[PDB]
Amino acid sequence: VNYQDLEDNLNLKGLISLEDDRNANFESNVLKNEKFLDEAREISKKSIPEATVKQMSHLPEFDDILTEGAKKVESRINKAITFRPSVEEFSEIQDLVKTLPKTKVIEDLSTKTNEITEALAATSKTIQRTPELKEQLKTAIEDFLQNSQGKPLTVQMIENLNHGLRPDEGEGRLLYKKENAVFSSPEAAKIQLAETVDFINRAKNEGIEPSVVGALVYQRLIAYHPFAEGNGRMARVIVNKILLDAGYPAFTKFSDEFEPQIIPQTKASTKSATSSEVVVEFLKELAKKGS
Ligand SMILES: [Zn+2]
Ligand SMILES: [Zn+2]
Numbered sequence: 001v002n003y004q005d006l007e008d009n010l011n012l013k014g015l016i017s018l019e020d021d022r023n024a025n026f027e028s029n030v031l032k033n034e035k036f037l038d039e040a041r042e043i044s045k046k047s048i049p050e051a052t053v054k055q056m057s058h059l060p061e062f063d064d065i066l067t068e069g070a071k072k073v074e075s076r077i078n079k080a081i082t083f084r085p086s087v088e089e090f091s092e093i094q095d096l097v098k099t100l101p102k103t104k105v106i107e108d109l110s111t112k113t114n115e116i117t118e119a120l121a122a123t124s125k126t127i128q129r130t131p132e133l134k135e136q137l138k139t140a141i142e143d144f145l146q147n148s149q150g151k152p153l154t155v156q157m158i159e160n161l162n163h164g165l166r167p168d169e170g171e172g173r174l175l176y177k178k179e180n181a182v183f184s185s186p187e188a189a190k191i192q193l194a195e196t197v198d199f200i201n202r203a204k205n206e207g208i209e210p211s212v213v214g215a216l217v218y219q220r221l222i223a224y225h226p227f228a229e230g231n232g233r234m235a236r237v238i239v240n241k242i243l244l245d246a247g248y249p250a251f252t253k254f255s256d257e258f259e260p261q262i263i264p265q266t267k268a269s270t271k272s273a274t275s276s277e278v279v280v281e282f283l284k285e286l287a288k289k290g291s
Helices: 012-024 026-031 034-047 052-056 068-081 087-098 109-122 125-129 131-148 155-164 186-205 210-224 231-244 275-287
Strands: none
Touching: 012 026, 012 087, 012 186, 012 210, 026 068, 026 186, 034 068, 034 186, 068 210, 087 210, 087 275, 109 125, 109 131, 109 231, 125 131, 131 155, 131 231, 155 186, 155 231, 186 210, 210 231, 210 275
């Protein structure tokens, strides 16, 4: 698909270039990453005996038999999140961004903190019903906004945010998941969380339309699902920092019945939404914020 001759002010072409490069290096960075492969082998061996392991240790194919499922899963996820719109989608996105609500006020941290907190509470009845939970989530959000302002996002910031967004769990809880819709493996998720941080930062440096970046970050953070818990909470806060830094109102969630579509589903049928379709829907949902 050639985009050169399409008119573009979102720097959607830069975005597409970013994705092209990441996608082109996906095999090397993920599928052929030895930490990914060894974890995959270790995880696979858990199910198997208990007898059959040492047995098949001598089988030439074994090191691969152990990793074929995990590889397929990551390739599937990558296919779903990689941004490559049709000409019709490219243009639809162009028009849709023009219609987005955007404030002119230079909102302060307290204002941003409250907007993100309220947006989070809207996506959860438990938060709405538990004042003490809402308040401690608000604090984690404030800390995150405070520490990340005018600074490059880091994985460490996201780790601290995830931890802060889980006050409803005892301490000593797992930060990253150790095991597992179909989400990335633990290591694949860690690798690609770091890549997503890179994406967020580079997109800002290249002035790629924040609303589209937010949509893409939303989808892939949910697909990767790196943490033991609080992935939804964390993704929504990160996406909303991206949006609010650009002057957009906070995003809450997709409709009750499009949310399932944005990542690969184990279930055969189940409408699967493509990356472009997710961006289009995200932008539409966002444009309804004013109403
Ligand atoms: Zn802790
Ligand atoms: Zn605002």
